[PDB]
Ligand binder design. Structure first.
Ligand SMILES: CC(=O)N[C@@H]1[C@@H](O)[C@H](O)[C@@H](CO)O[C@H]1O
Ligand SMILES: CC(=O)N[C@@H]1[C@@H](O)[C@H](O)[C@@H](CO)O[C@H]1O
Ligand SMILES: CC(=O)N[C@@H]1[C@@H](O)[C@H](O)[C@@H](CO)O[C@H]1O
Ligand SMILES: CC(=O)N[C@@H]1[C@@H](O)[C@H](O)[C@@H](CO)O[C@H]1O
Ligand SMILES: CC(=O)N[C@@H]1[C@@H](O)[C@H](O)[C@@H](CO)O[C@H]1O
Ligand SMILES: CC(=O)N[C@@H]1[C@@H](O)[C@H](O)[C@@H](CO)O[C@H]1O
Ligand SMILES: CC(=O)N[C@@H]1[C@@H](O)[C@H](O)[C@@H](CO)O[C@H]1O
Ligand SMILES: Cc1ccc(C)c(N)c1
Ligand SMILES: [Cu+2]
Ligand SMILES: [Cu+2]
Ligand SMILES: [Cu+2]
Ligand SMILES: [Cu+2]
Length: 499
């Protein structure tokens, strides 16, 4: 892939991953952006060159590196109006951060409005030179990365506020729509007897996917960048922005096998080969598979996921047994989402800048009602009670700057204070199951961090909140480069359309 130091030139271009031509936001020439890679400990210097020209998809841009804690570099997190002002067309900005005690599968994508739905998204992998699970597989490179994308024929700002289905699922950049069943599919090669570490990443904007491979099992060894105890699975339900590394042994008869990624809504099923890709054993003919899907008897269940290494759940083994506990009461009034009676709306001055400029607490920070103060070095517990007042469930919630422990998973009434996995994106389940997904984390990273549903269309509608973590240490902990301090002046000078 493209080493720790690289340029990411953003432009507009007509594209047709599913056979349908449409203008989009492209990175270095392609929508599923280029795979970015590096090793644990590597310093990353990703220069984002904004050469966009299309206002309707927004000439401005900002990029978030999903999963990375960005400790000491809160200004490079990406969230527009949270940690920075957007980059302006004709300008470039350098994201320069280090990745220390982190290694696994991630991705990058615009964090400006719904722009990542229009194409600014790509996979990001950080290898571990001494990976604990290295002995469990033979191949792990550019070809074992699998990306899932919900592709729309209509641009994000031109279609419905809430699409309710993508025209086609893209696996590794390719796929078919009910109207383009002869479009080329992605092919993933495996050689007999070899074990592969496949890195499954959802770059989705709304759909969650039920992923499976005909005739093959899958051993999960990673969830959202956290090393996981090996778990043999039949199928994987992956929500927006989640990731899973699973080992697959090419131990079946040399042949072509269907790789399925069935979305929860939109064009479901596999008629005409949609929502599909191809697993091709060396020696197999270049033809479509004809293998049949069988019933899943070992579905992945988050509750069955455990950290590879013993990792203590912050706080105490009791409900609320924590320093600060917060419940997120979800709501919707039609066009907009709410969290604790507030509907997020981007402030003009980015929250990081507000704090650097003197912001002393939650009351000062804007927008009002969407910011929470978090004391440093403390245990936090948050609950997301599924309420039908919030349509669109299951809502995958995401926390920036930290990995959290899922003490209670969707579709379960258990509270695990001893063995829960840690991850950064979690499904908050749904209301007939009486779900009440609950997570915990320790405030070990000073700075303002976003917390929101990763269904971009819901984020755009205000389904978000901001955590102002340890406000006093914020400015000192996150020194900002000149280029960052210039972002806002150059962005605010732009005319509404001359974006
Ligand atoms: C991605 C997208 O929105 N595509 C639009 C298309 O629907 C519209 O008809 C055309 C105007 O001629 O502009 C382009
Ligand atoms: C000249 C050009 O590319 N303009 C496009 C327009 O056709 C399209 O409707 C929109 C959303 O994709 O982006 C812009
Ligand atoms: C290791 C294990 O659990 N065995 C399963 C088997 O029961 C199932 O029929 C098959 C489906 O592909 O995958 C394997
Ligand atoms: C935030 C929190 O965990 N505390 C509340 C507690 O005050 C209340 O009595 C209980 C029943 O509604 O729900 C929980
Ligand atoms: C008319 C009405 O009661 N609905 C409002 C809606 O217009 C507004 O956008 C939302 C968040 O401010 O609160 C509610
Ligand atoms: C998106 C937004 O700003 N919300 C507005 C709210 O301020 C206003 O009060 C309402 C009309 O009553 O329309 C909506
Ligand atoms: C209605 C519901 O089930 N949601 C619960 C809420 O009552 C409680 O305050 C919170 C703290 O444990 O956990 C969640
Ligand atoms: C409001 C609303 C209704 C239905 C779905 C599937 C989403 N995402 C959002
Ligand atoms: Cu993130
Ligand atoms: Cu994200
Ligand atoms: Cu949502
Ligand atoms: Cu985010």
């Amino acid at each position: 892939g493209i080493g720790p130091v690289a340029d990411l030139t953003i432009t507009n271009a007509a594209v047709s991953p599913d056979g349908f031509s449409r203008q989009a936001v492209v990175v270095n020439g392609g929508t599923p952006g280029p795979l970015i890679t590096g090793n644990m400990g590597d310093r990353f210097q990703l220069n984002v060159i904004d050469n966009l020209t299309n206002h309707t998809m927004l000439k401005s841009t900002s990029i978030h590196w999903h999963g990375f804690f960005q400790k000491g570099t809160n200004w490079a997190d990406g969230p527009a109006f949270i940690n920075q002002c957007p980059i302006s067309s004709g300008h470039s900005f350098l994201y320069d951060f280090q990745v220390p005690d982190q290694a696994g599968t991630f991705w990058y994508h615009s964090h400006l409005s719904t722009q990542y739905c229009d194409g600014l998204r790509g996979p990001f992998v950080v290898y571990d030179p001494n990976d604990p699970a290295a002995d469990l597989y033979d191949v792990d490179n550019d070809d074992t990365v699998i990306t899932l994308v919900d592709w729309y024929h209509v641009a994000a700002k031109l279609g419905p506020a809430f699409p309710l289905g993508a025209d086609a699922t893209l696996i590794n950049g390719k796929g078919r729509s009910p109207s383009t069943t002869t479009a080329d599919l992605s092919v993933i090669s495996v050689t007999p007897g070899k074990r592969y570490r496949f890195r499954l990443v959802s770059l989705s904007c709304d759909p969650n996917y039920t992923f499976s491979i005909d005739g093959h099992n899958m051993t999960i060894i990673e969830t959202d960048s956290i090393n996981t105890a090996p778990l043999v699975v039949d199928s994987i339900q992956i929500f927006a922005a989640q990731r899973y590394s699973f080992v697959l042994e090419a131990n079946q008869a040399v042949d072509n096998y269907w790789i399925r990624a069935n979305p929860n809504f939109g064009n479901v099923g596999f008629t005409g080969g949609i929502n599909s890709a191809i697993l091709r054993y060396d020696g197999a003919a270049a033809v479509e598979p004809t293998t049949t899907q069988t019933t899943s008897t070992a579905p992945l269940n988050e509750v069955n996921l455990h950290p590879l290494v013993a990792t203590a759940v912050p706080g105490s083994p009791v409900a609320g047994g924590v320093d600060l506990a917060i419940n997120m009461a979800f709501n919707f009034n039609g066009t907009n989402f709410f969290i604790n009676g507030a509907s997020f709306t981007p402030p003009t001055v980015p929250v990081l800048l507000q704090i650097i400029s003197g912001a002393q607490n939650a009351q000062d920070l804007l927008p009002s009602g969407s910011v929470y103060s978090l004391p440093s070095n403390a245990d936090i517990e948050i609950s997301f009670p599924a309420t039908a007042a919030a349509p669109g469930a299951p809502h995958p919630f995401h926390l920036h700057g930290h990995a959290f422990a899922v003490v209670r998973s969707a579709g379960s009434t258990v509270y695990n204070y001893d063995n829960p996995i840690f991850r950064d994106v979690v499904s908050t389940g749904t209301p007939a199951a009486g779900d009440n997904v609950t997570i915990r984390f320790r405030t070990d990273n000073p700075g303002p961090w976003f917390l929101h549903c990763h269904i971009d269309f819901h984020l755009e509608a205000g389904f978000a909140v901001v955590f102002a973590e340890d406000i006093p240490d914020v400015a000192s902990a996150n020194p900002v480069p000149q280029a960052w301090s210039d972002l806002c002046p150059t962005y605010d000078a732009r005319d509404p359309s001359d974006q």
